[PDB]
Amino acid sequence: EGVKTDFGPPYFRDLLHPVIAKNYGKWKYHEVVKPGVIKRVAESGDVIYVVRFGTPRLLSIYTVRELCDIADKYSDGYLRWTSRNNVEFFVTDESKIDDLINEVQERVGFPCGGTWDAVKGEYGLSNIVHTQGWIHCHTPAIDASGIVKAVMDELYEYFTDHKLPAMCRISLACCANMCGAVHASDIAIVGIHRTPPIPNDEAIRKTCEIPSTVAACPTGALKPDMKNKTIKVDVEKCMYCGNCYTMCPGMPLFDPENDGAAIMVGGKLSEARRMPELSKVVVPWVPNEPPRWPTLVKYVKQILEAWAANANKHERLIEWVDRIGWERFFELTGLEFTQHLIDDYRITPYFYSEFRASTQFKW
Amino acid sequence: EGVKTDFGPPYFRDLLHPVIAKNYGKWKYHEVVKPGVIKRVAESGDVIYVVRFGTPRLLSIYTVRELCDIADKYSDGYLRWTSRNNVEFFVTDESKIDDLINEVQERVGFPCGGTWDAVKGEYGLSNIVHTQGWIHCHTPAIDASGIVKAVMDELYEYFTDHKLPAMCRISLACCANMCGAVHASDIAIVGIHRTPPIPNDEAIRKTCEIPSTVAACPTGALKPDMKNKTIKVDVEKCMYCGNCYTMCPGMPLFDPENDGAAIMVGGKLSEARRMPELSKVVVPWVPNEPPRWPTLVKYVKQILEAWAANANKHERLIEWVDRIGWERFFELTGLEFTQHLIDDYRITPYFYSEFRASTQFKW
Amino acid sequence: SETPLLDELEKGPWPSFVKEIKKTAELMEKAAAEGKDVKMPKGARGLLKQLEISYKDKKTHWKHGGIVSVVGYGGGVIGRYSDLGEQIPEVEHFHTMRINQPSGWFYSTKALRGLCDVWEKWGSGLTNFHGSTGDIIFLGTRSEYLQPCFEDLGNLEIPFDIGGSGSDLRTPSACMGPALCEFACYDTLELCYDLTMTYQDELHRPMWPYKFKIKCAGCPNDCVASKARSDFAIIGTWKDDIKVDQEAVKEYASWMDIENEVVKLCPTGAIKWDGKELTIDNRECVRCMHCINKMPKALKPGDERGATILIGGKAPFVEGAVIGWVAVPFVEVEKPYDEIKEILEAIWDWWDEEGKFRERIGELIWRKGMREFLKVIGREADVRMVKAPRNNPFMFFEKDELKPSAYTEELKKRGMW
Amino acid sequence: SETPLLDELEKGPWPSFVKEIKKTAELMEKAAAEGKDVKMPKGARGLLKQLEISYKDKKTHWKHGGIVSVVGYGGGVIGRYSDLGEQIPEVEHFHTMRINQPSGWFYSTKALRGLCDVWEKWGSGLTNFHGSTGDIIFLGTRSEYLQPCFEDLGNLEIPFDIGGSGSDLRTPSACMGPALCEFACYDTLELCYDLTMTYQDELHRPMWPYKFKIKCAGCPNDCVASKARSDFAIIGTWKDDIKVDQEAVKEYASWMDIENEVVKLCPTGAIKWDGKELTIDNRECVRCMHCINKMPKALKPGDERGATILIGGKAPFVEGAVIGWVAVPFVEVEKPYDEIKEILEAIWDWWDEEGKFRERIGELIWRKGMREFLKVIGREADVRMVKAPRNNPFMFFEKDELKPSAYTEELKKRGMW
Lengths: 363, 363, 417, 417
Ligand code: SRM
Ligand code: SRM
Ligand code: SRM
Ligand code: SRM
Ligand code: SF4
Ligand code: SF4
Ligand code: SF4
Ligand code: SF4
Ligand code: SF4
Ligand code: SF4
Ligand code: SF4
Ligand code: SF4
Ligand SMILES: [C-]#N
Ligand SMILES: [C-]#N
Ligand SMILES: [C-]#N
Hints:
Chain A has 363 residues and is of the alpha+beta class. Chain A is 27% helix and 19% strand.
C-alpha cells in the first residue's frame, strides 16, 4: 500500500460549528458587544458569539488539550485561531459567555480581549505577531517571545479594553528577514546587527557556495578571494544585514553587545481611509537586556502613549503623521532624529514608488 | 598688459531704471492691471508699470537695436528679460502705455501678455522655454523653435489674455538631455529616439574613448569589444536615450522616421498649495512633421483645453490630477494608457522619493 | 532556581510562554514516568535550559541545520541543531515540522486531540499556534522520529499533512471570510483549500528558484496581511454599487457623527450625508471599506464580486521590502478557479525559466519589466497598475511599433532586429 | 522660393524666429555691401538654408565639434560644425559664445547697442535672449573670430565677459528679487553677482568632474526654476511670522472668496478667516507662499529672512532627473555671504576629490550618502531633509557608536576597523 502522502490538510467544512456551517456566507451583521466578544447575526436569525482570548502563541500540547475540554463544555467542540494568533470560541447561549471567559481565565490564564470596534471608534491592542528568536532560530539578533511578553505585560490594559482611538498593530521580527508583516505595522520591533561578519575561511571553503553567497549581499560588499578560495568583505560597504550568514555558516556577524532592535512606525495594511504603507525607522537601536528589555519597552510605550494622547478617532499612527508632519512627530514622541534615519538602501528602484501597492483605484 | 580677463558681467545696479534703483528692495504691492501690464507701487509711494511682451527667443541684433529705440522712447534707456524670455518695459506714465503696446506690435511684431494674476485667479499662458534643436545642436530628436512657433500660433489667444483658471507652463526639450525646466513643467515636450545606435567601428577607433562611452550607458547596453577595438550594443537593453552619442560620434541613433516627441504632464516648480513635482509621460510618441507638427500641436491643445475645462481656480494640472486621479485623467484627455508609461528606469534609487524635494517644512 | 532569568517572565499579567515550556516539561516527564510511550520526555526541559543560557549570553545557541525531511517530500521539515549538544544532548537535534492548518484555522476538538496525541509520542510537546505563514508548528523532534510521526499523522481519524518550506509553494492561508464575516467578497476558505490541494506537488517537492506564498483576503481590509506577506495576494473586491439601507443609515444618524467619522474620512469624497439621504458616488469610490466598516448594518459591498490580484509582496531581501502592487485589477473567483490557476501556472513556468537562484517573483518583475510580466499572464497594461505614469522619457518600443525606414532596414541587414 | 517649409512659419500671429533669421541675413549683407566692417555677412543665410535642408530631412545637420575657446579660458565657447560644410561654406564652423548676463537680465540701451556692434562685426548677427542657464547667446562664428570678438567685448565702455560652459561653475542666475518684487527675502541680484565675481576662475577654467549650476530665487515661488535646473538652489525663506494687515484683509474679503480661494488651498490648514479676523498659525505654516500670492496688499513674509538651500537639482542623465532636496534648512544671506561660500567651497573640495568623471553632485550624494555630505559641509542631520524616515532597518553605524566588546576587539585585532 505505502505511506499516504499528498493528502493535504483536513477539509475545513468538516471542522465548522454546525451553526457556522449552516449560515456560511449568509450573515447580516456583526456587533462588538464588549472587549473580547463579537455578536454575529445570520440571515436565518441564528446568533452566535465569537469570544476572543490572547495567547502566548507557543503552546504546550497540554494547554491545547485544556482548551479542547473548554471548547467541548462551551463551544460544542469547536474553535479557531485568528491571523494574529488569538484563540476564539463560539457560543450560542449568550448567558454562558461570561462562564466561558472566567473558565478560560482560570484554567489556562488567557485573557479575554484583542477586539476593537470601528462603529463606536474604540480599539483594543491585539496580540503581537512575532517569531522564533532564541527559542529556535539560528539567525536572530533579538529574542521574540521574551520581548513580546515584556511589552504585553506593560500594555496589558490596552488588550483587555477598547482604550485606543484607532487601530494600532505591534509586530516583532527577530532579524531583518521579518518572517511576518512586521514591515507594515503601526509599531514594529526589528532585530538588527551593527557589526560586520568576519570570514571564517575554513568554514567558507568547506560549506559555502561562494558566487551565491556573494550575490546575496545587497551592497556588493562581498568579493570572492580566488587565491584562498574564500570571500572577502569590504567593511565600508557592509550594513550588517545578516544575509551572508543566512547563505553561509562561515560568515557569522553576531555581537551580543551590539545586536539589538530598531523601532519602526507608521505601517498600514488595510485600505480604509488611506493607502497601505511600509513602517519607518524612528529609533535606530536599543540593546538586548533580557529578561525584561526595559529600554526597548520604554520606547515602544513612549511612542504608543504619544500617538494615543494626540490622535483623532480612527487616525492610525501613519494617519496622525500625515496630519502633523514628522517634525512634530519627533517632538511629541521625544525622539531624536539622526543621520541613521536618512534612507541609503541604494538597490531599491524608484519606479516601485510609482506602482499602485494598494487595491484602491476607480473603475 | 595682454588682455582683460576675469572681469565678469557688467554690474546690474548701474543698469537699473532710476525709479527702480531709487525704490530697490522697498516695494509695497503690485497689481496686475490688464494682461501684460503690472503696476508696481513703491513704499515711497512711487508708481511703476512693468509692460511684458513675447519674443521668439532667437533674435536678430537689428531687432535688439529696434527694441533699444523703443526702450529710449518709453522706458528711459532700460528694459529687462524674464526667466522665460519675455521682454519687459518700465513705464512711468500710464497714458503712454497703450502707445508703447501699439508701437511694439507695429515695429518688432511682439504681442503684449504672458502675465497672470493669482489675485483674481485668472492666468495667461506664458512663453515656452526651449533649446536649440536643428538650429544648432548635434543631438536633437526634434526641432525646438518651429514647434514653439507652431504651438503658440495655435494657442496665441492664451498669451494675450488671462484665459486660464490656474498657471500652466509649456516647456520643450529637443532631446533627453532635457535642457531647461522641461522635467518639471505642467506640459512638456521631449524629443526622443526609438531606435538603437548602429556602431560605426571606424569612427569609434579614431574618435572615441570606449571606457567612458561604455560607462555612460544608463542600462549597461554597451560592452567594449577589444578585438576589433570597438563597442558592442545589446539592443534588448537599449532604450535609445542618445547618451552614448553625446560621448562618441560613432554611435548615432537618428532615424528621421522614428524620432519624435513624448508629451509629459504634471510637473510643478513653485511651492504654492502643493509640493513641486516632476513631469510624467502621458503620450509616448508623436512624429516630426515640419513645418507645423500637426499631431504634436493637436495633443498639446487637447490636453491644455481638457484640463482648462475641468480645473478649479488655482488648480494646476498636477493638482487637477491629485483631485480626479489618473484613471479619470486619461478618460477626460482622451488618451490611451499603454505599457510604455509604466516606469522601468532601474537606476534611480527609491530613497530619492523619501527626500524633501521642496522648501515646505515646519520650523 | 535553575532558570532565574526566565523565571522573571512567569511574573506579569500576560500569559507566559515560560509557563507553557515548563508545563510541557513537567507533564511529558510525568507521562514517561507513568510508562506512557513518549519518545522525547526531556526535550522541553532541554529547550528551557538552552534558552536560559541564551538569556545569559544574549545570543542564539542554534547553528545552521542539516537538511532533513520525511520520505517523499523535500519540504516542510526544518533541521535545527544546538551548539550545546554535548551539555544538553536532548536538544542536539531539535527540528520543526510544519503541519498544514485547515483553512482559516477552524478546528474541532477531535482534530486537535489527534495532533496532541501524536506530538506527545514523537516530539517535545511544544507547538506554535500558528506559524506566521499559517501552519501549526510542531517545535522540536529528532531525525529518527520525523517519518514515524508523519505516518501517525496520516493515520489519524482526522489526518494532517505536512505544510511547505524551502523553494516551494508555501501553505496558502485565508482570512475567516464567509464563515463569519459579512464583508467577504468570495469564499476565501474554499479557494485556499482548493489551491492547497491542486498544488500539493508544488508544495511538498521544492522545484523553484525560491519560495512563493499565496494568501487570500475576503475584502480590502486584508485581515491576513496578504499584500505584505504573500507574493500573490488575492484580495476580495466588487465592481458595482455599494448597497445602502437608507433606514439603517438614519438609525446610525441618531447617535453617530456621520459627517466627521465617515463623510470626512472617505479618501475620495465619494460619500455624502445630508441628514435625510446617504449618497455614494460609486465612480469615485475606491472601495477602501471605511464607510462599510463604520456602518455594517446599513452598507454592504456590491453584488458583482471577485478579487484584485496584488503581486510581489515580500520581506526586504535582497532588493527591498514590498507591499504587493496591482497585477490584475479584477478576476472572478468561482470554483474550480481556472482563471486564477491559469495566471499562477503561467507565472510559475516563466519564473522557473528566467528566475535566478533565490530571486523572488517581485524581484524578477523588477528585473524583466511589467511588459514581459503582462505578456506572460496575457493581460494588457492598465492605468490602475500605477500610482503615476513614468517620470522620465526612457521608453522601450516594440520593433513592430516602429515605422519602416532606411534605418530599420539597416538594423535588419546587420541582424540587430 | 528658397525656403518653402520654413516660409510657412512666417505665417501666424506669434513672433516668427524665421523672420528673425531672414531679417539678419538681409541686413548683414546690405551692410557688407556698404563697406561696413562685417566679417561674416553670409552666415545668417548659410543658417537659413541649412535649417531648411533639416526640415526636409527631418534631422539635424550639425556634427560633433572640436574643442575651441579663447586664450586664458577653457569654457564659454561651444564649437559646432556643419556636415554640409562644402555645400554651405559659411557654416562649416559656427560656434556659440556664451556671454555673461547682468543679474536679473537688467539692461540699459548702451549695454545692448555695444553687444550689437561687436556681434555685427565678428558674428552671424543671430543671438538668443536668453540662453536657458541665463547667458546671452551669440549664435554662430568662426574660430579666428573668437579671440578678436572677446577683446572687443572686454574693450567696450560697458564690457561683457564670457559666461560658463564645460566642467565648470556655470553662470549663476537670479529672479528679479528686490529690483521689482515685494516678495523678495534677500538681494538675489547682489548674491548672483558676488558669486559670479568671487568664482570667476572656477567659471572660466573648468577643473571639476562635471558642471555645477547655481540659481537664486527671492522666495519659495522660485521664479528661476532653481530647484529643477541648478545643483545648488538658494531659495529665499523666513523664520518668523507672516505680517498681516487686518483691514487690508477686510478690503480683500469684500469681494474675494477667501474661504475657498485661500483657506481651503493652504496645504497645512494654518490660515483662518472668520469674517472679522485673519489668523495664521505660523507653527503650522510651511511657507508655500499661497496666501501671500493671493493677498499681496495685506500679507508679507516675516522679517527674519534668509534662504533654504536645496541640493542636487539636474536633468535625467545618468541616474535620473532631480528636483533638489533640503541640504540647509536655513542660512543667512548677508554680504559677503561667507557662510554660503564656505558651503560651496567645501562641496567643491569634496566633489573634486571623490567624484567620477561626469558625476553630478546629486549623484555623488546618492553614492556616498548624506552622513558624508553633511560632514563635508559641517552640518547636522535634520528631520526637515526627508519626507519620511527610512523604510528599512539597514543602517550604517559609526564605529565610535558601538559598545566595546570581544567582537569589536576581534575586528581591531584583524584590522577590520
Ligand atoms: C478575526 C480576524 C480575521 C481572521 O481570520 O482571523 C479579523 C476580523 C475582523 N476584521 Fe480584521 N481581522 C483580523 C486581522 C486583521 C489584520 C491582519 C493583521 O493585523 O495582521 C488587519 C490588517 C491590519 C492593518 O491594517 O495594518 C485587519 C484589519 C481590519 C480593518 C482595518 C482597520 C483600520 O481602521 O484600518 C477592519 C475594519 C474595522 O476596524 O472594523 C477589520 C475588521 C474586521 C471585522 C470587524 C470584519 C467583520 O465584519 O466581522 C472582523 C472583527 C474584528 C474586530 O475585532 O472588530 N479588520 N484585521 C483577525 C483577527 C486578528 C486579531 O486576533 O486581532
Ligand atoms: C517558522 C516561521 C517563523 C515563525 O515562528 O512564525 C519562519 C521561520 C523562518 N524563516 Fe521565514 N518564517 C515564517 C514566515 C515568514 C514570513 C511571513 C509569511 O510566510 O506569512 C516572511 C515574509 C514574507 C516573505 O517570505 O518574504 C518570512 C521571511 C523570511 C525571509 C526573507 C525572504 C525575503 O525574500 O526576504 C527568510 C530568508 C530566506 O528565505 O532565506 C526566512 C527564513 C526563515 C528561517 C528558515 C531562517 C533563515 O534565516 O534561514 C526560519 C526558520 C527558523 C526555525 O528554524 O525555526 N523567512 N518568513 C514562519 C513560517 C512558519 C509557518 O509555516 O507558518
Ligand atoms: C517676471 C518673473 C520674474 C523674473 O523674470 O525674474 C516672475 C515674476 C513674478 N512671479 Fe513668478 N515670475 C517669473 C517666473 C516664474 C516661473 C519660472 C518658470 O516658469 O520657469 C514660475 C515657476 C513655475 C512653476 O511653479 O512651475 C513662477 C512662479 C510664480 C508663482 C506660481 C503660481 C502657482 O500657483 O504656482 C507665483 C504666484 C502668483 O501666481 O502670484 C509667481 C508670482 C510672480 C510675481 C507675481 C511676484 C510679485 O510679487 O511681483 C511676479 C509677477 C508676474 C506675474 O505675471 O504676475 N511666480 N514665476 C518671471 C518670468 C515670467 C514670464 O512669464 O516670462
Ligand atoms: C545653450 C543651451 C541651450 C539653449 O539654447 O538654451 C544648452 C545646450 C547644450 N547643452 Fe545643456 N544647454 C542649456 C542649458 C541647460 C539647462 C538649464 C540651465 O542650465 O538652467 C539644463 C538642465 C540642468 C542641468 O544641467 O542638468 C541643461 C542640461 C544639459 C544636459 C544634461 C545634464 C545632466 O547631468 O543630465 C547635457 C549633457 C552634458 O552636459 O553632457 C547638456 C549639454 C549641452 C550641449 C553642450 C549638447 C551636448 O550634448 O554636448 C548643448 C549645446 C548646444 C549648442 O551647441 O548650442 N545640457 N542644459 C542652454 C544654455 C544657454 C546658456 O549658457 O545660458
Ligand atoms: S525573523 Fe529572523 S530570527 Fe525570526 S525566525 Fe525569521 S529568520 Fe529567524
Ligand atoms: S552582512 Fe549584509 S551587507 Fe554585510 S556583507 Fe553580509 S550581506 Fe553584505
Ligand atoms: S536639449 Fe538636447 S538638443 Fe536641445 S540643446 Fe540641449 S542637448 Fe541640444
Ligand atoms: S542609446 Fe542609451 S541605452 Fe542605448 S546604448 Fe546608448 S546609452 Fe545605452
Ligand atoms: S478580510 Fe474582509 S472578509 Fe476577511 S475577515 Fe477581514 S473584513 Fe472579513
Ligand atoms: S468605500 Fe471608502 S472610498 Fe468608497 S465611499 Fe466608502 S469610504 Fe469612500
Ligand atoms: S521668486 Fe519670489 S522674489 Fe523672486 S520674483 Fe518670484 S516671487 Fe518675486
Ligand atoms: S504660506 Fe502657505 S502654508 Fe503658510 S499660511 Fe499661507 S497658505 Fe498656508
Ligand atoms: C519563510 N520561512
Ligand atoms: C511559509 N512557510
Ligand atoms: C550645458 N548645459
